[PDB]
Amino acid sequence: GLPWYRVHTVLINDPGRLIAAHLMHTALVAGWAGSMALYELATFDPSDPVLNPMWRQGMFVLPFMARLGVTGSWSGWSITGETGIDPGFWSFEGVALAHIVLSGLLFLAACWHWVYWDLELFRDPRTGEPALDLPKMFGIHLFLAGLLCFGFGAFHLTGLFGPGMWVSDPYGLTGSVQPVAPEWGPDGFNPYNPGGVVAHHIAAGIVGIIAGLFHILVRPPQRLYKALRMGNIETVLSSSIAAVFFAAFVVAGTMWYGSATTPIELFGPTRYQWDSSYFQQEINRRVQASLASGATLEEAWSAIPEKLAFYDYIGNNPAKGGLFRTGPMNKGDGIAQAWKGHAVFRNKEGEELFVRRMPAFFESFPVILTDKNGVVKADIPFRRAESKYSFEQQGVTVSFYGGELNGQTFTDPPTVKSYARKAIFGEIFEFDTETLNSDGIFRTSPRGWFTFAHAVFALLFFFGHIWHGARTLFRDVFSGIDPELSPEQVEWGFYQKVGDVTTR
Amino acid sequence: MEPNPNRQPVELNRTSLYLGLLLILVLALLFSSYFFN
Amino acid sequence: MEVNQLGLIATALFVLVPSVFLIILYVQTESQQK
């Protein structure tokens, strides 16, 4: 009988039952979407979009609902922290419900197409054999896709008839859903320009429509029909798998490097913002602007938004996790409660010292303090016997500005050391580690998990493509080679052209 | 080896499958509260 | 809530083991000739 890994091949010549199986797959996926949204709603804490946003809480589908304009709950809250909003039906709950109902209907349709597989529609009218006109089908489906793409761009994203999309400032402080106008100049191909996403769906939509009509009205060249085996549905399987792993590598990339479609308020900051100290540079700029305007040190640092400071913290860097460190980021360092304020370290001579930050590569990292020129001034020693730079020897103190420890100064070596230890992670926060029994070990954000899943799946679908492409082009021999294969066909020099018996 | 003459084929018809699964699932629906306690 | 931690696996196995027993028996019945 069929081996276990071939059971589904019974679908190859049964268009009706193939459609049933696809309906069932679609039902399962829609059902997964519904279920996932329900679970996230049952676990999501909406009370603090500043220090406890969705990406700290292991939310995976919530940011995708938010990206396209679903930001409210029937229960009255919004992901931007508003209250007393009426989201209408299309709340998170509404979306979940819609997906569940869709799943049900698809299930039922699947049953019908499974039972009534033998429709005349699936029969070649000349031969009576099952047959699908794949090139014309491609035309039809591409036309439809083009319509839908165009409409998504022209109506949804523009806000012309729809909510728009998530946009934000360059530091992800004030994100919200807005209508976006298409950008038709070169900056449209800038990944950080949303106008480009709009323009894309409009233009690629129109192109999809034109090309769709082309593929509906014009038959394939015989030479391509033969070369790509267009009578064989597995060829479509191969090229579709190729298209899909391409798409998957792309979304993995734009998730990891960031773009207008992977906002940091929805997925968390990127690793490269930590690498280049993006947020720290902005914070320092603001503080300096404040001081230059006549503010005090305490005033300048207190004017820094907690949200901004929280971005400047390595616990939110997606490159600090673990493959089997499961769950939300809150399960690691804890649920962030408050900024402690900016720590300034000084030695006994009153020189300001700066803690060397941990690079993402390192699970652990030493504690080293330098002056503004990178000269080592203090550290926490391993071996003590020849220590020169201990906090005790150098009389290191730490004063805080802004946040909850604002205006306070600490001089006892243990406390100063503890804060130095925290300064290697960037800005310092107070965490609730009790509510979730957090274990103090960094976990990655949804930016990380999405990127991982999709790079892996992409890589695997490469093999899928290879396998099904092979199955397509070698259909004649995949039960074995011609038992009467003449030795002359593989001997050397018998034919002038390899495998061409007409060239003896 | 001589084949054993005492062998017998076994059957479970579809209706018995449905009854059995109903029994198991309903028993589980009943006892699970007590399992979580 | 503070539920018994084995309740989950207990329930899952309570369902799966006899369900699977039945599924095995049913399928090998269907696969018999006639």
Binding site: C111 | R14, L22, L25, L29, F36 | G7, V15
Partner: peptide, 30 residues
């Protein structure tokens, strides 16, 4: 996970209703 378990079992029971009714072995007169 308790809630998930209860709802799961219930859902399986409803599915079983569907199969037991629409995919029963058909009664046949001899």
């Amino acid at each position: 996970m308790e809630t998930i378990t209860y709802v799961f079992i219930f859902a399986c029971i409803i599915a079983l209703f569907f199969f037991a009714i629409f995919f029963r072995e058909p009664p046949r007169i001899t």
